[PDB]
Design an enzyme around this catalytic site. Structure first.
Site, PDB file in Angstrom:
ATOM      1  N   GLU A 121      -8.333   1.344   9.594  1.00 26.40           N
ATOM      2  CA  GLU A 121      -8.902   1.207   8.259  1.00 26.40           C
ATOM      3  C   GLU A 121      -9.044  -0.275   7.931  1.00 26.40           C
ATOM      4  O   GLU A 121     -10.069  -0.703   7.364  1.00 26.40           O
ATOM      5  CB  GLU A 121      -8.048   1.929   7.196  1.00 26.40           C
ATOM      6  CG  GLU A 121      -8.852   2.385   5.951  1.00 26.40           C
ATOM      7  CD  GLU A 121      -9.219   1.243   5.011  1.00 26.40           C
ATOM      8  OE1 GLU A 121     -10.374   1.217   4.534  1.00 26.40           O
ATOM      9  OE2 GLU A 121      -8.358   0.402   4.739  1.00 26.40           O
ATOM     10  N   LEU A 135       0.828  -1.210   0.000  1.00 23.88           N
ATOM     11  CA  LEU A 135       0.000   0.000   0.000  1.00 23.88           C
ATOM     12  C   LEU A 135       0.873   1.274   0.000  1.00 23.88           C
ATOM     13  O   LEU A 135       2.037   1.216   0.412  1.00 23.88           O
ATOM     14  CB  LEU A 135      -0.961  -0.022   1.195  1.00 23.88           C
ATOM     15  CG  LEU A 135      -1.877  -1.253   1.298  1.00 23.88           C
ATOM     16  CD1 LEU A 135      -2.661  -1.230   2.592  1.00 23.88           C
ATOM     17  CD2 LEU A 135      -2.814  -1.376   0.107  1.00 23.88           C
TER      18      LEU A 135
HETATM   19  N1  LIG Z   1      -7.757  -1.176  -1.192  1.00 22.56           N
HETATM   20  C1  LIG Z   1      -6.494  -0.983  -1.563  1.00 22.56           C
HETATM   21  O1  LIG Z   1      -5.867   0.053  -1.355  1.00 22.56           O
HETATM   22  C2  LIG Z   1      -5.846  -2.166  -2.286  1.00 22.56           C
HETATM   23  C3  LIG Z   1      -4.698  -1.969  -3.046  1.00 22.56           C
HETATM   24  N2  LIG Z   1      -4.106  -3.052  -3.707  1.00 22.56           N
HETATM   25  C4  LIG Z   1      -2.886  -2.848  -4.517  1.00 22.56           C
HETATM   26  O2  LIG Z   1      -3.034  -3.490  -5.792  1.00 22.56           O
HETATM   27  C5  LIG Z   1      -1.690  -3.618  -6.277  1.00 22.56           C
HETATM   28  C6  LIG Z   1      -1.634  -4.676  -7.380  1.00 22.56           C
HETATM   29  O3  LIG Z   1      -2.619  -4.420  -8.385  1.00 22.56           O
HETATM   30  P1  LIG Z   1      -2.521  -5.156  -9.813  1.00 22.56           P
HETATM   31  O4  LIG Z   1      -1.286  -4.706 -10.492  1.00 22.56           O
HETATM   32  O5  LIG Z   1      -3.823  -5.022 -10.504  1.00 22.56           O
HETATM   33  O6  LIG Z   1      -2.331  -6.696  -9.382  1.00 22.56           O
HETATM   34  P2  LIG Z   1      -3.610  -7.578  -8.963  1.00 22.56           P
HETATM   35  O7  LIG Z   1      -3.895  -7.344  -7.530  1.00 22.56           O
HETATM   36  O8  LIG Z   1      -4.679  -7.363  -9.962  1.00 22.56           O
HETATM   37  O9  LIG Z   1      -3.052  -9.078  -9.130  1.00 22.56           O
HETATM   38  C7  LIG Z   1      -2.479  -9.494 -10.373  1.00 22.56           C
HETATM   39  C8  LIG Z   1      -3.114 -10.796 -10.860  1.00 22.56           C
HETATM   40  O10 LIG Z   1      -4.498 -10.578 -11.172  1.00 22.56           O
HETATM   41  C9  LIG Z   1      -4.847 -11.689 -12.009  1.00 22.56           C
HETATM   42  N3  LIG Z   1      -6.074 -11.376 -12.772  1.00 22.56           N
HETATM   43  C10 LIG Z   1      -6.613 -10.166 -12.926  1.00 22.56           C
HETATM   44  N4  LIG Z   1      -7.713 -10.265 -13.674  1.00 22.56           N
HETATM   45  C11 LIG Z   1      -7.873 -11.544 -13.997  1.00 22.56           C
HETATM   46  C12 LIG Z   1      -8.817 -12.234 -14.742  1.00 22.56           C
HETATM   47  N5  LIG Z   1      -9.833 -11.589 -15.309  1.00 22.56           N
HETATM   48  N6  LIG Z   1      -8.688 -13.561 -14.882  1.00 22.56           N
HETATM   49  C13 LIG Z   1      -7.678 -14.207 -14.320  1.00 22.56           C
HETATM   50  N7  LIG Z   1      -6.762 -13.577 -13.603  1.00 22.56           N
HETATM   51  C14 LIG Z   1      -6.832 -12.250 -13.425  1.00 22.56           C
HETATM   52  C15 LIG Z   1      -3.662 -11.826 -12.965  1.00 22.56           C
HETATM   53  O11 LIG Z   1      -3.402 -13.209 -13.213  1.00 22.56           O
HETATM   54  P3  LIG Z   1      -2.399 -13.640 -14.393  1.00 22.56           P
HETATM   55  O12 LIG Z   1      -1.105 -12.698 -14.245  1.00 22.56           O
HETATM   56  O13 LIG Z   1      -2.064 -15.081 -14.361  1.00 22.56           O
HETATM   57  O14 LIG Z   1      -3.114 -13.201 -15.765  1.00 22.56           O
HETATM   58  C16 LIG Z   1      -2.494 -11.214 -12.193  1.00 22.56           C
HETATM   59  O15 LIG Z   1      -1.494 -12.209 -11.967  1.00 22.56           O
HETATM   60  C17 LIG Z   1      -0.897  -4.091  -5.060  1.00 22.56           C
HETATM   61  O16 LIG Z   1       0.397  -3.484  -5.063  1.00 22.56           O
HETATM   62  C18 LIG Z   1      -1.704  -3.570  -3.871  1.00 22.56           C
HETATM   63  O17 LIG Z   1      -0.918  -2.637  -3.127  1.00 22.56           O
HETATM   64  C19 LIG Z   1      -4.672  -4.327  -3.600  1.00 22.56           C
HETATM   65  C20 LIG Z   1      -5.820  -4.513  -2.836  1.00 22.56           C
HETATM   66  C21 LIG Z   1      -6.404  -3.435  -2.182  1.00 22.56           C
HETATM   67  N1  LIG Z   2     -10.910  -0.502   2.405  1.00 19.15           N
HETATM   68  C1  LIG Z   2     -10.002  -1.359   2.031  1.00 19.15           C
HETATM   69  N2  LIG Z   2     -10.266  -2.147   0.996  1.00 19.15           N
HETATM   70  C2  LIG Z   2      -9.364  -3.024   0.563  1.00 19.15           C
HETATM   71  N3  LIG Z   2      -9.618  -3.782  -0.478  1.00 19.15           N
HETATM   72  C3  LIG Z   2      -8.157  -3.167   1.233  1.00 19.15           C
HETATM   73  N4  LIG Z   2      -7.229  -4.047   0.841  1.00 19.15           N
HETATM   74  C4  LIG Z   2      -6.079  -4.180   1.510  1.00 19.15           C
HETATM   75  C5  LIG Z   2      -5.031  -5.201   0.946  1.00 19.15           C
HETATM   76  N5  LIG Z   2      -3.964  -5.724   1.819  1.00 19.15           N
HETATM   77  C6  LIG Z   2      -4.212  -6.345   2.905  1.00 19.15           C
HETATM   78  C7  LIG Z   2      -5.254  -7.247   2.800  1.00 19.15           C
HETATM   79  C8  LIG Z   2      -5.556  -8.048   3.891  1.00 19.15           C
HETATM   80  C9  LIG Z   2      -4.808  -7.997   5.055  1.00 19.15           C
HETATM   81  O1  LIG Z   2      -5.116  -8.769   6.125  1.00 19.15           O
HETATM   82  C10 LIG Z   2      -3.741  -7.106   5.129  1.00 19.15           C
HETATM   83  C11 LIG Z   2      -3.451  -6.295   4.041  1.00 19.15           C
HETATM   84  C12 LIG Z   2      -2.346  -5.518   4.292  1.00 19.15           C
HETATM   85  C13 LIG Z   2      -1.427  -5.116   3.349  1.00 19.15           C
HETATM   86  C14 LIG Z   2      -1.482  -5.351   1.998  1.00 19.15           C
HETATM   87  C15 LIG Z   2      -0.354  -4.943   1.324  1.00 19.15           C
HETATM   88  C16 LIG Z   2      -0.249  -5.003  -0.052  1.00 19.15           C
HETATM   89  C17 LIG Z   2      -1.243  -5.574  -0.823  1.00 19.15           C
HETATM   90  C18 LIG Z   2      -2.418  -6.001  -0.241  1.00 19.15           C
HETATM   91  C19 LIG Z   2      -2.616  -6.046   1.270  1.00 19.15           C
HETATM   92  C20 LIG Z   2      -5.850  -3.350   2.598  1.00 19.15           C
HETATM   93  N6  LIG Z   2      -6.765  -2.501   2.981  1.00 19.15           N
HETATM   94  C21 LIG Z   2      -7.913  -2.350   2.312  1.00 19.15           C
HETATM   95  N7  LIG Z   2      -8.860  -1.494   2.713  1.00 19.15           N
END
Ligand SMILES: NC(=O)C1=CN([C@@H]2O[C@H](COP(=O)(O)OP(=O)(O)OC[C@H]3O[C@@H](n4cnc5c(N)ncnc54)[C@H](OP(=O)(O)O)[C@@H]3O)[C@@H](O)[C@H]2O)C=CC1
Ligand SMILES: Nc1nc(N)c2nc(CN3c4ccc(O)cc4C=CC4=CCC=C[C@@H]43)cnc2n1
Length: 186
Positions: A30, A22
């Site tokens: 959060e 993140l």
């Molecule tokens: N709420 C928040 O602030 C959150 C933030 N994040 C951030 O997201 C960042 C990464 O995002 P991103 O680059 O999109 O990586 P993703 O989290 O999307 O993960 C990548 C994987 O998604 C798979 N994928 C996506 N779409 C499909 C599909 N339609 N079918 C099959 N597989 C799929 C791909 O598989 P394959 O490569 O095999 O095609 C790829 O390997 C992280 O650094 C994290 O920090 C994540 C969650 C929450």
């Molecule tokens: N509101 C909201 N919605 C989300 N989807 C969300 N996702 C996360 C994802 N996260 C997390 C998801 C679950 C978890 O238990 C811990 C984390 C903490 C750190 C993380 C670091 C890098 C990548 C993913 C990871 C962390 N916070 C989030 N908050």
């Protein structure tokens, strides 16, 4: 189970990620909200279900996988077996959504949550039908390399209130944030 929910935390510059983590330091309060909303089912005996991309799955600390008390689905086009700890693997979002609607999960899934990453939000947001976006507005800029798609206010309605969601500005570690819920029908 037919409405699809996305949940995300986003910075002022629409950032969600940096180097597979993140953009901000850990906001444990959060995280508590994320836990509560994704875990709390509406009925005893059913679990909520989380869908996430493969990079998000592996970036979650191992000690916290699978996300506890939720059914976890990982999307990947390259993996052939579910990652250790994951309940299901799907090769597309449509495969996952079709799986969830199978009868032998009817009693076994309540709410469906898309929990990231960028890739997956984009695809979910391209879809017709009922979508909710649970958006935490982190009221600060952070250097990011992964971002959330545009939220067109002609398409999404900002719900003035939502059950179980508090509207006041929150603060942790000098970082302000607030919880929003958007909805797209049809
Ligand atoms: N709420 C928040 O602030 C959150 C933030 N994040 C951030 O997201 C960042 C990464 O995002 P991103 O680059 O999109 O990586 P993703 O989290 O999307 O993960 C990548 C994987 O998604 C798979 N994928 C996506 N779409 C499909 C599909 N339609 N079918 C099959 N597989 C799929 C791909 O598989 P394959 O490569 O095999 O095609 C790829 O390997 C992280 O650094 C994290 O920090 C994540 C969650 C929450
Ligand atoms: N509101 C909201 N919605 C989300 N989807 C969300 N996702 C996360 C994802 N996260 C997390 C998801 C679950 C978890 O238990 C811990 C984390 C903490 C750190 C993380 C670091 C890098 C990548 C993913 C990871 C962390 N916070 C989030 N908050």
């Amino acid at each position: 189970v037919r409405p699809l929910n996305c949940i995300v935390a986003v910075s002022q510059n629409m950032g969600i990620g940096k180097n597979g983590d993140l953009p901000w330091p850990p906001l444990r309060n959060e995280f508590k909200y994320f836990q509560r909303m994704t875990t709390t089912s509406s009925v005893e005996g059913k679990q909520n279900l989380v869908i996430m991309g493969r990079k998000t799955w592996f970036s979650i600390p191992e000690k916290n996988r699978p996300l506890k008390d939720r059914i976890n689905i990982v999307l990947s086009r390259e993996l052939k077996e579910p990652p250790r700890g994951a309940h299901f693997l799907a090769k597309s979002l449509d495969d996952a959504l079709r799986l969830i609607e199978q009868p032998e999960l009817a009693s076994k899934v309540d709410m469906v949550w898309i929990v990231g990453g960028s890739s997956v939000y984009q695809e979910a947001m391209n879809q017709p039908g009922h979508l909710r976006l649970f958006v935490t507005r982190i009221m600060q800029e952070f250097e990011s390399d992964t971002f959330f798609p545009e939220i067109d206010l002609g398409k999404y309605k900002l719900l003035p209130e939502y059950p179980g969601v508090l509207s006041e500005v929150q603060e942790e570690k000098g970082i302000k944030y607030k919880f929003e819920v958007y909805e797209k029908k049809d």
